[PDB]
PDB file of N, CA and C in Angstrom:
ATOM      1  N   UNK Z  53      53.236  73.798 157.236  1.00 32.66           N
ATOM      2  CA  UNK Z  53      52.052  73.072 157.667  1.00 32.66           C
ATOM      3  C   UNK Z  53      51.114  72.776 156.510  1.00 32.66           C
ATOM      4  N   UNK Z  54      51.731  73.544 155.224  1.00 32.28           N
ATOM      5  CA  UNK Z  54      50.650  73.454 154.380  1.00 32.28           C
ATOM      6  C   UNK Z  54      51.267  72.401 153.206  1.00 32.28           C
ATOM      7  N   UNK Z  55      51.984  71.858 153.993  1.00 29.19           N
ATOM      8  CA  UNK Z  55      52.484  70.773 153.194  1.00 29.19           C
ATOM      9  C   UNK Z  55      52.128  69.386 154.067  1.00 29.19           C
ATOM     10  N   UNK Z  56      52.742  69.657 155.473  1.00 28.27           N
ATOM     11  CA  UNK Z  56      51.799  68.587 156.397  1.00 28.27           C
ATOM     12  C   UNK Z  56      50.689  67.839 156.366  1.00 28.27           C
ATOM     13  N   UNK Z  57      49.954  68.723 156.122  1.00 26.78           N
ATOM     14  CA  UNK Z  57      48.194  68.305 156.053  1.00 26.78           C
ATOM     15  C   UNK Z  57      48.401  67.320 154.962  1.00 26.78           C
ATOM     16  N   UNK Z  58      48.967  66.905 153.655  1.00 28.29           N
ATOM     17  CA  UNK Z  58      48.895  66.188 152.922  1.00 28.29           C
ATOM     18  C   UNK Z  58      49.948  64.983 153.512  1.00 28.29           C
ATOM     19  N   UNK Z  59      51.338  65.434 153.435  1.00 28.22           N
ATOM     20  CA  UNK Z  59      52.532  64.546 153.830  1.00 28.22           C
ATOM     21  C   UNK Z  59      52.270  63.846 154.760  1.00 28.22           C
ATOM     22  N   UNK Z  60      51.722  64.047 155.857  1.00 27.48           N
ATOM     23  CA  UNK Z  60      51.430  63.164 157.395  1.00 27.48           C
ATOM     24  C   UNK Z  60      50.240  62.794 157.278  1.00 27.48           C
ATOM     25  N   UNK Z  61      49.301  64.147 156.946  1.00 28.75           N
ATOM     26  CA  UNK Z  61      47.958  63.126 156.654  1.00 28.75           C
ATOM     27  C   UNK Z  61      47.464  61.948 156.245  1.00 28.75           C
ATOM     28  N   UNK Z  62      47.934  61.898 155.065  1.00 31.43           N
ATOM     29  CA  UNK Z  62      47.883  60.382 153.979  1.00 31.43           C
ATOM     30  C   UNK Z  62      48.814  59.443 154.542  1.00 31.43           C
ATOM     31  N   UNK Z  63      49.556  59.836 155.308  1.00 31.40           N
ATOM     32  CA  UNK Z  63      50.694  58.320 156.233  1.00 31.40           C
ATOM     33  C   UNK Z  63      50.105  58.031 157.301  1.00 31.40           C
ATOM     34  N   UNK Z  64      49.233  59.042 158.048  1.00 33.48           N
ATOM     35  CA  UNK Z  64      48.125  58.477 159.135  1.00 33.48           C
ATOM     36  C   UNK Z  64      47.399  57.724 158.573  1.00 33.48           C
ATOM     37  N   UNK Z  65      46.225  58.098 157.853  1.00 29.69           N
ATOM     38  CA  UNK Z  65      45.126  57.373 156.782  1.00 29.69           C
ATOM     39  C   UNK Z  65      45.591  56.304 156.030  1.00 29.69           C
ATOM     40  N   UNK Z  66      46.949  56.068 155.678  1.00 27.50           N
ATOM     41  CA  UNK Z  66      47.269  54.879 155.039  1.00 27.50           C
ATOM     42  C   UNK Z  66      47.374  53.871 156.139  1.00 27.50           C
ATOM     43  N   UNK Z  67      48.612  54.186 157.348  1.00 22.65           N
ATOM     44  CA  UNK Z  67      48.959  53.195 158.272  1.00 22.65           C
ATOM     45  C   UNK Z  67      47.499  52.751 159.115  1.00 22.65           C
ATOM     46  N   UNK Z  68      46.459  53.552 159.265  1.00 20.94           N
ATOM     47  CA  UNK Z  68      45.073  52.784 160.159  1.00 20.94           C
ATOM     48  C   UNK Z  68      44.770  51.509 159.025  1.00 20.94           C
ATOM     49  N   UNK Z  69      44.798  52.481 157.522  1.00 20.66           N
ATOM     50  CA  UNK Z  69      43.943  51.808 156.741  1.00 20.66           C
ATOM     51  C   UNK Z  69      44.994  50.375 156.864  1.00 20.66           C
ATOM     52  N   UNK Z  70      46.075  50.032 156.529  1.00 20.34           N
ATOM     53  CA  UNK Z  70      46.941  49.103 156.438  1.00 20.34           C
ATOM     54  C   UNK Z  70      46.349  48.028 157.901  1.00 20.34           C
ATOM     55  N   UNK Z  71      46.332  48.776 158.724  1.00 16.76           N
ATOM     56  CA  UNK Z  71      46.138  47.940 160.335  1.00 16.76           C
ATOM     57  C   UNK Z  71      44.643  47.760 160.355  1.00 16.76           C
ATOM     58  N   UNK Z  72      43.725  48.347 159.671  1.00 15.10           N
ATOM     59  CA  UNK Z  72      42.099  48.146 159.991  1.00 15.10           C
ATOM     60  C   UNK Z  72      42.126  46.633 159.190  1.00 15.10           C
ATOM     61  N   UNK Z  73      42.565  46.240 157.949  1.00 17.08           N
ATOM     62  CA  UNK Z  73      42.665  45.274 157.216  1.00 17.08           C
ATOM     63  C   UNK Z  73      43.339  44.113 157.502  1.00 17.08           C
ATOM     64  N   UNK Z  74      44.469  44.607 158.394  1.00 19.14           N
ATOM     65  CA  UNK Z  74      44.627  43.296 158.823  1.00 19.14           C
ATOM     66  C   UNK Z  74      45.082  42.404 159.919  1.00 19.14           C
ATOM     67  N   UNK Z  75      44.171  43.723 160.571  1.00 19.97           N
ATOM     68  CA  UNK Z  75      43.351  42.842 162.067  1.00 19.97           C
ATOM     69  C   UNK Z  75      42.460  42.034 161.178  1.00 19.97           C
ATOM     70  N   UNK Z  76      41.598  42.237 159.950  1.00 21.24           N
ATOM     71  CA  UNK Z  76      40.816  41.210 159.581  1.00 21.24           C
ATOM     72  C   UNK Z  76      41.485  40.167 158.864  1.00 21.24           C
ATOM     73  N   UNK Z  77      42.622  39.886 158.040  1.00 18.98           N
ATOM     74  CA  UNK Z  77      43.684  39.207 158.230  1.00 18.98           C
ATOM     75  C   UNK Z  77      43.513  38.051 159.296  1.00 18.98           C
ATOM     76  N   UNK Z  78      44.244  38.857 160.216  1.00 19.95           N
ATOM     77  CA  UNK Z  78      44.175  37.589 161.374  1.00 19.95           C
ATOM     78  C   UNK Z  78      42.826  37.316 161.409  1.00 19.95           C
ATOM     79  N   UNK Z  79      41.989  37.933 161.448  1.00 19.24           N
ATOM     80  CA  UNK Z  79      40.530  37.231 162.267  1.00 19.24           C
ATOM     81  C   UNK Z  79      40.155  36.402 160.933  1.00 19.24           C
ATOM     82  N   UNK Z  80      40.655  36.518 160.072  1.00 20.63           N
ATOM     83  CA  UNK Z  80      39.992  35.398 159.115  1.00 20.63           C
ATOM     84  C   UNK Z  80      41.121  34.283 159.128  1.00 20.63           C
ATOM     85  N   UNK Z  81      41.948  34.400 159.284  1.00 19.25           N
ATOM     86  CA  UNK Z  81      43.095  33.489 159.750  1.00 19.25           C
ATOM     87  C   UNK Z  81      42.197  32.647 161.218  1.00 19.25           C
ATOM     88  N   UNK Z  82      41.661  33.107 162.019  1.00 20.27           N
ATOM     89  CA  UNK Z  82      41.276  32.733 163.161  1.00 20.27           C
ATOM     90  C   UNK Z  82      39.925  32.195 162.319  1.00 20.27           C
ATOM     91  N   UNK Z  83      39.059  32.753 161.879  1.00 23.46           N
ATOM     92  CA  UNK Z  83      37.760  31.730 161.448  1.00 23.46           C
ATOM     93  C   UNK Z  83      38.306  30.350 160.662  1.00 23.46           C
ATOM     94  N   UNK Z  84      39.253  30.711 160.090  1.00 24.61           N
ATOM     95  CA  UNK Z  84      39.637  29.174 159.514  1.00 24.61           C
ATOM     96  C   UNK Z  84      39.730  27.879 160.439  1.00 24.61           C
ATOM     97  N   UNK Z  85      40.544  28.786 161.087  1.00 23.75           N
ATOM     98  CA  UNK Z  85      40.869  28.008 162.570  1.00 23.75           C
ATOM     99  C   UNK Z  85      39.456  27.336 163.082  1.00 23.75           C
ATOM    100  N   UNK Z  86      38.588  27.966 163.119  1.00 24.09           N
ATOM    101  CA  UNK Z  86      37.423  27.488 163.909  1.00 24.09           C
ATOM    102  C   UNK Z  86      37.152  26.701 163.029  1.00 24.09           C
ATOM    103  N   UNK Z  87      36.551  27.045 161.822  1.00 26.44           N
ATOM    104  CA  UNK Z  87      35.822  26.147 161.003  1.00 26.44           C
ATOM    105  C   UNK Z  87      36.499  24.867 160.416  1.00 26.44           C
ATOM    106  N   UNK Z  88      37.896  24.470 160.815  1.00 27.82           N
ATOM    107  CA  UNK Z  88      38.335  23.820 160.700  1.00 27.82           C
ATOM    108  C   UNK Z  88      38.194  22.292 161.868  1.00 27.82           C
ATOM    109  N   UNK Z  89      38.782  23.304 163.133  1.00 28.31           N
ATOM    110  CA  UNK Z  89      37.819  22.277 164.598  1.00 28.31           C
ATOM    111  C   UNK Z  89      36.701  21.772 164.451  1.00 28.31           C
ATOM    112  N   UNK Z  90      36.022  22.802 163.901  1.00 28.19           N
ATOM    113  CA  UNK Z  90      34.257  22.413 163.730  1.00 28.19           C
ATOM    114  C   UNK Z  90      34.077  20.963 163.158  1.00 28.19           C
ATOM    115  N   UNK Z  91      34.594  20.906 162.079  1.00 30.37           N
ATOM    116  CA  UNK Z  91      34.763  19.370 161.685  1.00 30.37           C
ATOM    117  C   UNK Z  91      35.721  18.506 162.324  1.00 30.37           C
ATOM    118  N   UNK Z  92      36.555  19.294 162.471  1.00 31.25           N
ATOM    119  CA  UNK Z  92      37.467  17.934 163.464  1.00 31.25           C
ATOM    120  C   UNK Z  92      37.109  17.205 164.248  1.00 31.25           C
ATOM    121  N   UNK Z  93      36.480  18.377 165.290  1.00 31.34           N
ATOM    122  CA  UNK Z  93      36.379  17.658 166.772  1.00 31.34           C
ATOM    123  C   UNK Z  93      34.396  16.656 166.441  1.00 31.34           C
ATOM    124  N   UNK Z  94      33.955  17.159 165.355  1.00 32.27           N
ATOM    125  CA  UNK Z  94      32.309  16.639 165.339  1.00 32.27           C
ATOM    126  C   UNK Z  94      32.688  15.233 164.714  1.00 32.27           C
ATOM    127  N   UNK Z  95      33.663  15.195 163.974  1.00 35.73           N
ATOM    128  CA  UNK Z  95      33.958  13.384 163.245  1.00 35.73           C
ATOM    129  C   UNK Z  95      34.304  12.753 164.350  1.00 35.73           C
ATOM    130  N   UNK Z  96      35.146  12.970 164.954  1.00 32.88           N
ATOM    131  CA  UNK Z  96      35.360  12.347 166.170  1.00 32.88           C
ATOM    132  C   UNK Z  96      34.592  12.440 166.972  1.00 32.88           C
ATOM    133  N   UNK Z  97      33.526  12.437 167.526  1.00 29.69           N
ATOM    134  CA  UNK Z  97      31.888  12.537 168.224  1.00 29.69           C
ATOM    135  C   UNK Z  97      31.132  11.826 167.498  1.00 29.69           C
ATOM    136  N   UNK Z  98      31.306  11.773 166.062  1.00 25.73           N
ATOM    137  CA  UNK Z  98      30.301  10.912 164.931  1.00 25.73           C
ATOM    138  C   UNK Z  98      31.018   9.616 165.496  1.00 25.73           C
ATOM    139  N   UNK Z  99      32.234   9.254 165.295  1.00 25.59           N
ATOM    140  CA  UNK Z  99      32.597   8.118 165.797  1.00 25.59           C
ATOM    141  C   UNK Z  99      33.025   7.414 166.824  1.00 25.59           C
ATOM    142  N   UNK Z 100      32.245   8.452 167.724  1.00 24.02           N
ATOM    143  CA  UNK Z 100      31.814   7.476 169.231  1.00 24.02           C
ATOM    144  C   UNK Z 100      30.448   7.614 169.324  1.00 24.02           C
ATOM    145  N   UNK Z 101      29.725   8.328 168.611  1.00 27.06           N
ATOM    146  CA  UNK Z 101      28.212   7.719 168.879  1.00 27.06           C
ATOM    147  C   UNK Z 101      27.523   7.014 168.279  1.00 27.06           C
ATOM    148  N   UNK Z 102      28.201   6.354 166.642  1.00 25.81           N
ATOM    149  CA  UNK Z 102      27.782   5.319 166.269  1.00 25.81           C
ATOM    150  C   UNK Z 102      28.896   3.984 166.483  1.00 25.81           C
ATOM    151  N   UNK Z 103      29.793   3.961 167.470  1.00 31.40           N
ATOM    152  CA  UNK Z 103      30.162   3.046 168.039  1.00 31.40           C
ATOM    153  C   UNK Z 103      29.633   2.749 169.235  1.00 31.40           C
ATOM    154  N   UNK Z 104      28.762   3.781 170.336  1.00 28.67           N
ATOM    155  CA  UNK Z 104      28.152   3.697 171.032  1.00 28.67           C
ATOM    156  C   UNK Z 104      26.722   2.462 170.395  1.00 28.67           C
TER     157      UNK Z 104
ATOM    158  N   UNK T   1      49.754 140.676 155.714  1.00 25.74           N
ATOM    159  CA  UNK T   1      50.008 141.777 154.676  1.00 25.74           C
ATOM    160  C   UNK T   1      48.852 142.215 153.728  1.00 25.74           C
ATOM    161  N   UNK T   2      49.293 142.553 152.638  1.00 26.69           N
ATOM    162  CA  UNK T   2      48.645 142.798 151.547  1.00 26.69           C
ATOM    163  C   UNK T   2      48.353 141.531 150.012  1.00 26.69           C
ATOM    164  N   UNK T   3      47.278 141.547 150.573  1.00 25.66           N
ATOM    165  CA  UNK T   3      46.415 140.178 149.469  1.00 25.66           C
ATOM    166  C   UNK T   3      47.138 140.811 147.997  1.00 25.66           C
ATOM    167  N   UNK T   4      47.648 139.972 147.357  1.00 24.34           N
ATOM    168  CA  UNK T   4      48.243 139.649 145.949  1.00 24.34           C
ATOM    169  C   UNK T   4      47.973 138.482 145.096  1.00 24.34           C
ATOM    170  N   UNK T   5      47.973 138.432 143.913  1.00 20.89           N
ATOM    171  CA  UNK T   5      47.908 137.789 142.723  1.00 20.89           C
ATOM    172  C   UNK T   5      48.350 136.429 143.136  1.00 20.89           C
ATOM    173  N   UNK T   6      49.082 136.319 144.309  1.00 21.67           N
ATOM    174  CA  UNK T   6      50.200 135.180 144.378  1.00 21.67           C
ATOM    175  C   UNK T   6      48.945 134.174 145.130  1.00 21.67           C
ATOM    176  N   UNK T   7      47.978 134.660 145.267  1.00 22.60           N
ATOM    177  CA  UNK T   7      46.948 133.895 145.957  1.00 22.60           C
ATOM    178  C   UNK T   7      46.170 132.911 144.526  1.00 22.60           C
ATOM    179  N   UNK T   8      46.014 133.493 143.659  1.00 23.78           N
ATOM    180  CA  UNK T   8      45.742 132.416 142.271  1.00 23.78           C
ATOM    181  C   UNK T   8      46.878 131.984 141.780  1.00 23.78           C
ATOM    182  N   UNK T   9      48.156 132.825 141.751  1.00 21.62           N
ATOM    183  CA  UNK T   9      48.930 132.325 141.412  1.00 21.62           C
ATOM    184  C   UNK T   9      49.533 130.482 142.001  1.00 21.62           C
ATOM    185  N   UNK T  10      48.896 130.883 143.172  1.00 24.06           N
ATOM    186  CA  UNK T  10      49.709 129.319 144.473  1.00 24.06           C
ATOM    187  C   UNK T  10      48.432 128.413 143.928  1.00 24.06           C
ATOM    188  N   UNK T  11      47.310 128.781 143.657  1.00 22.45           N
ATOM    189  CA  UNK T  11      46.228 127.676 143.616  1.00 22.45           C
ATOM    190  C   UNK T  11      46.632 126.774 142.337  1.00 22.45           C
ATOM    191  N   UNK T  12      47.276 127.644 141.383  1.00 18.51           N
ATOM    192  CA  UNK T  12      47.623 126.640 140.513  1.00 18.51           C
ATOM    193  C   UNK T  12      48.859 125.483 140.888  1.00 18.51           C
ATOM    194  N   UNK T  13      49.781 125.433 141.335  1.00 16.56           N
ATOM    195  CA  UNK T  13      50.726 124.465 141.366  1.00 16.56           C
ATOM    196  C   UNK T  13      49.787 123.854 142.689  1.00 16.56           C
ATOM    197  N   UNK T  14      49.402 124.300 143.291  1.00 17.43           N
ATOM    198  CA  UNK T  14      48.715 123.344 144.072  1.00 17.43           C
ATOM    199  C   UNK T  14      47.605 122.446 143.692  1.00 17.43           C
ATOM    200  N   UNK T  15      46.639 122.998 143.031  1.00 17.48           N
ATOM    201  CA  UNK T  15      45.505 122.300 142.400  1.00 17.48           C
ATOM    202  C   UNK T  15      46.721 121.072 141.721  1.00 17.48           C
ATOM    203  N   UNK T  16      47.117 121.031 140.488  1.00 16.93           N
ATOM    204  CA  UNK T  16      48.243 120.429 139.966  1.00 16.93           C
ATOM    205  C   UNK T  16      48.737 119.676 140.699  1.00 16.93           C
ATOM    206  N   UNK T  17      50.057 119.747 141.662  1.00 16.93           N
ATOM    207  CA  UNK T  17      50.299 118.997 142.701  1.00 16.93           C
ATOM    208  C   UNK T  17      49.750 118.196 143.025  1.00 16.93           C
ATOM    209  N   UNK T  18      48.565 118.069 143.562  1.00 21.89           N
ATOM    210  CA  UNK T  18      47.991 116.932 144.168  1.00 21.89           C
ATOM    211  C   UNK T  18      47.326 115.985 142.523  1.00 21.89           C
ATOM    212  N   UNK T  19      46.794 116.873 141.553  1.00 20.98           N
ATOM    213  CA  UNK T  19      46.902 115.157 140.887  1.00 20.98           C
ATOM    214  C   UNK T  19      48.076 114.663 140.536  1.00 20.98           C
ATOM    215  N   UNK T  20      49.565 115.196 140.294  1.00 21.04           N
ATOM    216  CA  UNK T  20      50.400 114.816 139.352  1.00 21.04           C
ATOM    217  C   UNK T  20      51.203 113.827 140.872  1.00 21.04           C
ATOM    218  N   UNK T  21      50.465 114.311 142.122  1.00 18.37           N
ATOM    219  CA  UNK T  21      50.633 113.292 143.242  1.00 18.37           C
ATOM    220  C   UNK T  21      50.034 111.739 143.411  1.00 18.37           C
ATOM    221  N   UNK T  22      48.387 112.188 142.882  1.00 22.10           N
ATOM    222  CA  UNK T  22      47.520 111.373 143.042  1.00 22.10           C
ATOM    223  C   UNK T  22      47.707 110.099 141.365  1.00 22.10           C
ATOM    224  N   UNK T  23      47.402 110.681 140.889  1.00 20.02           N
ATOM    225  CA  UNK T  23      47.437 109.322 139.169  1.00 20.02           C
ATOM    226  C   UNK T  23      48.722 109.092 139.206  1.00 20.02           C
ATOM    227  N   UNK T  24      50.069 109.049 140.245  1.00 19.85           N
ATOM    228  CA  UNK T  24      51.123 108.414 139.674  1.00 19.85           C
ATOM    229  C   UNK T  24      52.002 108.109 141.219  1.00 19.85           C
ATOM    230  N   UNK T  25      51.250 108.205 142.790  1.00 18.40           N
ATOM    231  CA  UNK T  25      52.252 108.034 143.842  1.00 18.40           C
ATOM    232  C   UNK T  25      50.973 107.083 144.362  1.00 18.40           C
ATOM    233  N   UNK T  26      50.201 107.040 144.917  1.00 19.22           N
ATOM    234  CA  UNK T  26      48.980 107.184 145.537  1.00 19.22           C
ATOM    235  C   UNK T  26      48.825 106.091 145.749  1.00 19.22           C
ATOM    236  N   UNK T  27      48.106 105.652 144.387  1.00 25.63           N
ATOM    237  CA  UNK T  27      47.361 104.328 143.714  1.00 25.63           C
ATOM    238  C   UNK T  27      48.793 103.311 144.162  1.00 25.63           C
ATOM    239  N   UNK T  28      49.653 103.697 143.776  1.00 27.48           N
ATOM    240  CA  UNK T  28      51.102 102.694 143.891  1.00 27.48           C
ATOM    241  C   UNK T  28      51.532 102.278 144.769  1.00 27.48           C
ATOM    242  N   UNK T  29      52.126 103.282 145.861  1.00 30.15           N
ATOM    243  CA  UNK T  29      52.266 103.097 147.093  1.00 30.15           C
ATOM    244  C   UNK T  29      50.735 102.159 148.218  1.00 30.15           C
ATOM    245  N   UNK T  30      49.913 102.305 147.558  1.00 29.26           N
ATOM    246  CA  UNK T  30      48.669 101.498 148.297  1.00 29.26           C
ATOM    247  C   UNK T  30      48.425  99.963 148.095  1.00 29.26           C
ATOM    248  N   UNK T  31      49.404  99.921 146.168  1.00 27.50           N
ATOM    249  CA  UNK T  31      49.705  98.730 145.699  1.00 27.50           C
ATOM    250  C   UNK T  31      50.592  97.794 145.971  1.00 27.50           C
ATOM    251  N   UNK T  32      51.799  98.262 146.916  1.00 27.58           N
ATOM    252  CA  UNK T  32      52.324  97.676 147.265  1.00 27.58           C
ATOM    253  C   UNK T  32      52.265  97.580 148.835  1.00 27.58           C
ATOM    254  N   UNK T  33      51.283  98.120 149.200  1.00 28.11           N
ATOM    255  CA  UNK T  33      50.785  97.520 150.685  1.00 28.11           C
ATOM    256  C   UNK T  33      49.811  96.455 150.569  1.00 28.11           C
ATOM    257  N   UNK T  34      48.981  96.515 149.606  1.00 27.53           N
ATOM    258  CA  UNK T  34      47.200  95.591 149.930  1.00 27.53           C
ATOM    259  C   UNK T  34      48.242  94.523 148.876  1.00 27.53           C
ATOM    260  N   UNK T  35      48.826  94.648 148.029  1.00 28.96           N
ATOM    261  CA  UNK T  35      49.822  92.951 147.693  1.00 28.96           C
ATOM    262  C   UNK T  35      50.166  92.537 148.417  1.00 28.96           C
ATOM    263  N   UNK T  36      51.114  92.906 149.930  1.00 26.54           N
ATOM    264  CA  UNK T  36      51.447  92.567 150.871  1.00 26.54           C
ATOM    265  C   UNK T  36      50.483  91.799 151.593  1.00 26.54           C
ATOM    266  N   UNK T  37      49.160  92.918 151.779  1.00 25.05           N
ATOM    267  CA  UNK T  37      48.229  92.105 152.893  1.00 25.05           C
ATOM    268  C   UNK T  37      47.296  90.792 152.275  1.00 25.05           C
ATOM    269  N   UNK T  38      47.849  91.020 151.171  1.00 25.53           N
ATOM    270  CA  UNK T  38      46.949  89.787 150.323  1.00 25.53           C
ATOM    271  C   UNK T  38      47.896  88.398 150.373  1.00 25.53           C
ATOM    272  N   UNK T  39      48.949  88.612 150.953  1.00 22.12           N
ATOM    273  CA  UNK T  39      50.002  87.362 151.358  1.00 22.12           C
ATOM    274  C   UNK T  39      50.050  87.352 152.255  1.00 22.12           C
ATOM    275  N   UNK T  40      50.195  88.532 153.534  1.00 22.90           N
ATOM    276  CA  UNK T  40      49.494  87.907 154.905  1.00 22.90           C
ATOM    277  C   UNK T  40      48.215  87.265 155.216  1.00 22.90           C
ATOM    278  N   UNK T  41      47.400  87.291 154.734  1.00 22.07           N
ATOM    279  CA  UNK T  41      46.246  86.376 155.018  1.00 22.07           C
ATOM    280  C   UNK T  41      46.911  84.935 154.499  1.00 22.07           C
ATOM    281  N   UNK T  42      47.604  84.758 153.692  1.00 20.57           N
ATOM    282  CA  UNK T  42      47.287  82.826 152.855  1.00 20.57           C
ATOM    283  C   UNK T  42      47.868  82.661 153.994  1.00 20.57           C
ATOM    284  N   UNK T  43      49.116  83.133 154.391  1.00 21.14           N
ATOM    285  CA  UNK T  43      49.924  82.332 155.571  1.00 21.14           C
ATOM    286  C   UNK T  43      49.020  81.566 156.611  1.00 21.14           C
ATOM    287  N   UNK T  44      48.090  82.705 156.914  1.00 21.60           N
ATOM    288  CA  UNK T  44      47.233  82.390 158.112  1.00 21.60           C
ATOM    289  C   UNK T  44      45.960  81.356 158.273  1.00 21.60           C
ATOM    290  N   UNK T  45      45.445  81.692 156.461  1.00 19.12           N
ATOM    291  CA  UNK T  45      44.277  80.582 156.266  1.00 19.12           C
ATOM    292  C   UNK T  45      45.278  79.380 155.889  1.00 19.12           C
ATOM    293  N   UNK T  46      46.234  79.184 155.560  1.00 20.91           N
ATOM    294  CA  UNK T  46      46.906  77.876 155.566  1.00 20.91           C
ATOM    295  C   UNK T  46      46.643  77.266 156.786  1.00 20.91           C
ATOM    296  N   UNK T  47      47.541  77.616 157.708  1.00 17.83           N
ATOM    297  CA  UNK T  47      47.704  77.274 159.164  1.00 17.83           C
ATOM    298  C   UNK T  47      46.598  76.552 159.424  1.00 17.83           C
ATOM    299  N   UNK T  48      45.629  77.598 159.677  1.00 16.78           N
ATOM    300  CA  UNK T  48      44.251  77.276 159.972  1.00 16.78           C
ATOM    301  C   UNK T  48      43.463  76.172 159.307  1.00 16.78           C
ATOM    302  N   UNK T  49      43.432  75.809 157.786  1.00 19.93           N
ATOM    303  CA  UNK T  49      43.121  74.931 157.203  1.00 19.93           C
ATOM    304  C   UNK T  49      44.043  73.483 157.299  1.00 19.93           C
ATOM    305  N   UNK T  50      45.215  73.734 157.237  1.00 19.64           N
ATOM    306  CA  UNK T  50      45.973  72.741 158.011  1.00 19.64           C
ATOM    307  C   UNK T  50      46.277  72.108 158.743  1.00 19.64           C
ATOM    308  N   UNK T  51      45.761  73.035 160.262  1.00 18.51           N
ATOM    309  CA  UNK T  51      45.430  72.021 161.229  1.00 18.51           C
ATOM    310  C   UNK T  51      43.727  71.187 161.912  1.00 18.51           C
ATOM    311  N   UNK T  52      42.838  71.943 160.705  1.00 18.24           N
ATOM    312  CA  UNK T  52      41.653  70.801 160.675  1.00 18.24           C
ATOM    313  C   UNK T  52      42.003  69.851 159.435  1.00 18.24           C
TER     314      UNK T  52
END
């Protein structure tokens, strides 16, 4: 066990740390996403309300 | 019976006896118990530190 505490320990603490990072990964994968629509869908609104 | 010489005579190997017991069985035999108990404890504070 007194080898455990290090051997498993640090493979717990690594694998969260690995998965805490990149859930933010995706979620910045996902803000792109948005900020990408953001302009998409507003040019196309620019050009129906000055064709309006 | 009748008190004799053999009464100082016995105090000496006895007086004797017990140090030529004590400065060379004593101390030793106690040394190789409290070494012992000084390796039963790590086992235990391992454990214990190991599983916090």
């Amino acid at each position: 066990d007194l080898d455990l505490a290090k051997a498993s320990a640090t493979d717990q603490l690594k694998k969260a740390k690995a998965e805490a990072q990149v859930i933010i990964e995706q979620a910045n994968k996902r803000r792109s996403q948005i900020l990408d629509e953001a302009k998409a869908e507003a040019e196309q609104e620019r050009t129906k309300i000055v064709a309006q | 019976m009748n008190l004799n010489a053999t009464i100082l005579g016995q105090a000496i190997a006895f007086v004797l006896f017990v140090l030529f017991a004590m400065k060379y069985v004593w101390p030793p035999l106690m040394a190789a118990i409290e070494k012992r108990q000084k390796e039963i404890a790590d086992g235990l504070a391992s454990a214990e530190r190991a599983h916090k």
